[PDB]
Design a protein around this ligand. Structure first.
Ligand code: NAG
Ligand code: NAG
Ligand code: NAG
Ligand code: SHG
Ligand code: G2F
Length: 606
């Protein structure tokens, strides 16, 4: 279809499948394995991208061009890498991925949304769609086309360090929140065939259902460990949301570090090829996790040859190396040249990768749009995160006896109030992990509103707001306070660092609650990624709110404290009485919760 130097794969009017086949039929082995290789920006250069025909780049947690970088600095970095890839013989654009898992969260000034557990408390899949939408805009603001989200793990033990990344211990809630997918990628058209990848265009991003499969089912919640459960329970608990994801066109699927009955997911052909691809009819690409093929062996990385063989034969398409690309490429080349991995396997991987790239428009818009930069941190997105933060809150107690005046909602006018605790004025703590750094961080790490700031923005001008982080009991009794808001809880964590067998909050936490509440009527705001031992905090407190990890918009918290909106959130997980009970889920026989799944007190707006 027309000029003398026409190449069908470069013709935007042709069907994706015809373009895929046209390009694939031209490619060398090197160009093919290149597509299959994803590297960290930290190791990427223009020569490395060109010479190794690299298919993808990522930023892992905290992998940024510099601290504080602007949206434009990110666009320019990504476009630099693209320009190198576009200069190869075939000019195949790279796809750049990132963990945008509660907003565009590695980026300074990005809207930071509540983490997933809190979103589950909302029971509002439309709200989660809208968060998808806004996250896609903020990702494309930085020139990035691919988000490693949603995590559709079904966390079955809150001792897991990634429990906050699971919407619920109930798979039906997880299923309902796969609406993140069409928010990120766009709605699929009415005809659509379940399992096909989809992205609407340059203002949307490819998504990633992760981590396949049973990541939330591991023994004692140990991260990346073994999930022991028969097929029927794998398929009833851990798998269903993957089928919802196929029905909504999710473009990619990332594999878990975890094992199922002792078989590493990254080496599981039966599940990745037999089930995901051949039964669910998934046609997008399957990506490993970070050195996930290295971790097939024990010790990790002790037979990289076998890691390559086992993963690629299992059905993985794209490998998140992410650093030792030269070794990956050489090993896989040798396996193909030796007949150990057939060309049909390579060609299937490359067909899928290319399918997603063409489908999403990447050959038509390889470069960033500078007019999108101003989407970062936009107020309309902050307003959405604020609504989500408010909706996520679960009111656990609102009075010590059933005859007390309900403490919440608090009045905005009072002569003097106290805001206290390690989490009252600490933006990093209220965002949790995967915020600016991989592990998150402490303090004013990004743009946002702390609980303290939100208080001061909410109250009547005559109300004097005193902050003390850790006041003693005399300070409070002498202070002339009408009431106090005290916020305490978990520190940021991510992945295996967050695995915790005791689930007791760090001190001082309880001691400040006790000191404050012993002097004046108090509302305690508990910031956590999961249920934690709570009976001592409850016994001290007039009211207590589970606020989860509500993100940058701390005014969502005070919107409910001061009665601008009623409390509506409901527990999306079981609250245990003791960690010796665990695992314990809505359903077992020994089901003896402190608060059952679905519990939450309400208030009315004033
Ligand atoms: C689970 O963790 C244990 C104890 O740390 C370790 O020895 C074992 O290899 C892990 N198993 C898997 C399958 O990851
Ligand atoms: C419980 O576990 C955590 C994290 O693994 C540890 O840091 C903490 O000190 C423990 N708490 C107690 C009271 O032993
Ligand atoms: C809130 O409004 C509901 C719905 O009408 C009402 O029945 C409930 O008891 C109210 N509670 C308070 C404290 O106003
Ligand atoms: O374990 C080290 C690395 O692990 C990944 O899961 C993160 F995304 C990285 O940025 C991090 O530094
Ligand atoms: O950081 C890149 C990836 O590293 C591995 C993690 F388990 C996964 O959730 C993440 O998306």
């Amino acid at each position: 279809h027309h000029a003398a130097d026409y190449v069908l794969y470069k013709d935007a009017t042709k069907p994706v499948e015809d373009r895929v086949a046209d390009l694939l039929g031209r490619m060398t082995l090197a160009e093919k394995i290149g597509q299959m290789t994803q590297i960290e920006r930290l190791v990427a250069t223009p020569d490395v991208l060109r010479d190794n025909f690299i298919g993808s780049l990522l930023s892992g947690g905290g992998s940024v061009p510099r601290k504080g970088a602007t949206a434009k600095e990110w666009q320019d970095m990504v476009d630099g890498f693209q320009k190198a890839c576009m200069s190869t013989r075939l000019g195949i654009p790279m796809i750049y991925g990132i963990d945008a898992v509660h907003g565009q969260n590695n980026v300074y000034g990005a809207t930071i949304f509540p983490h997933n557990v809190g979103l589950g408390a909302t029971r509002d899949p439309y709200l989660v769609k809208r968060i998808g939408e806004a996250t896609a805009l903020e990702v494309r603001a930085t020139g990035i086309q691919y988000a490693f989200a949603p995590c559709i793990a079904v966390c079955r033990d809150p001792r897991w360090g990634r429990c906050y990344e699971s919407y619920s211990e109930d798979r039906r809630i997880v299923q309902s929140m796969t609406e993140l997918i069409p928010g990120l990628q766009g709605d699929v058209p009415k005809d659509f065939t379940s399992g096909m990848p989809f992205v609407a265009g340059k203002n949307k991003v490819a998504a990633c259902a992760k981590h396949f499969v049973g990541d939330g089912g591991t023994v004692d919640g140990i991260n990346a460990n073994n999930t022991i459960i028969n097929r029927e329970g794998l398929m009833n608990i851990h798998m269903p949301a993957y089928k919802n994801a196929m029905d909504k066109g999710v473009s990619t699927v990332m594999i878990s570090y975890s094992s199922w009955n002792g078989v590493k997911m990254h080496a599981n052909q039966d599940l990745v090829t037999g089930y995901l691809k051949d039964t669910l009819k998934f046609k997008g690409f399957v990506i490993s996790d970070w050195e996930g093929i290295d971790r097939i062996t024990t010790p990790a990385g002790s037979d990289y040859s076998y890691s390559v063989k086992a993963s690629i034969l299992a059905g993985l398409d794209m490998i998140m190396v992410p650093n030792k690309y030269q070794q990956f490429i050489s090993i896989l080349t040798g396996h193909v040249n030796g007949g150990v991995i057939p060309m049909s396997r390579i060609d299937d991987a490359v067909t899928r990768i290319l399918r997603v790239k063409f489908t999403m428009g990447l050959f038509e818009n390889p470069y960033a749009d500078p007019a999108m930069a101003e989407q970062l941190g936009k107020q309309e997105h902050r307003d959405l995160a604020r609504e989500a933060a408010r909706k996520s809150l679960v009111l656990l107690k609102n009075g010590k006896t059933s005859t007390d005046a309900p403490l919440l909602p608090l009045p905005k006018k009072a002569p003097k109030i106290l805001v206290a605790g390690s989490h009252a004025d600490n933006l990093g703590y209220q965002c949790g992990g995967w915020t600016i750094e991989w592990q998150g961080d402490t303090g004013r790490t990004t743009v946002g509103t702390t609980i303290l700031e939100a208080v001061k923005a909410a109250v009547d001008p005559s109300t004097v707001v005193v902050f003390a982080e850790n006041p003693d009991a005399e300070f409070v009794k002498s202070g002339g306070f009408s009431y106090a808001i005290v916020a305490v809880g978990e520190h940021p964590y991510t992945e295996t660092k967050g695995d915790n067998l005791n689930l007791t909050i760090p001190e001082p936490g309880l001691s400040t609650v006790q000191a404050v509440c012993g002097g004046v009527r108090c509302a305690t705001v508990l910031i956590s990624g999961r249920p934690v031992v709570v009976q001592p905090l409850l016994a001290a407190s007039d009211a207590l709110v589970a606020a989860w990890l509500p993100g940058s918009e701390g005014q969502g918290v005070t919107d409910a404290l001061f009665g601008d909106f009623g409390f509506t959130g409901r527990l999306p997980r079981t609250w245990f009485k003791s960690v010796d009970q665990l695992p314990m889920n809505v359903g077992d026989a020994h089901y003896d919760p402190l608060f059952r799944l679905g519990y939450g007190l309400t208030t009315n707006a004033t």
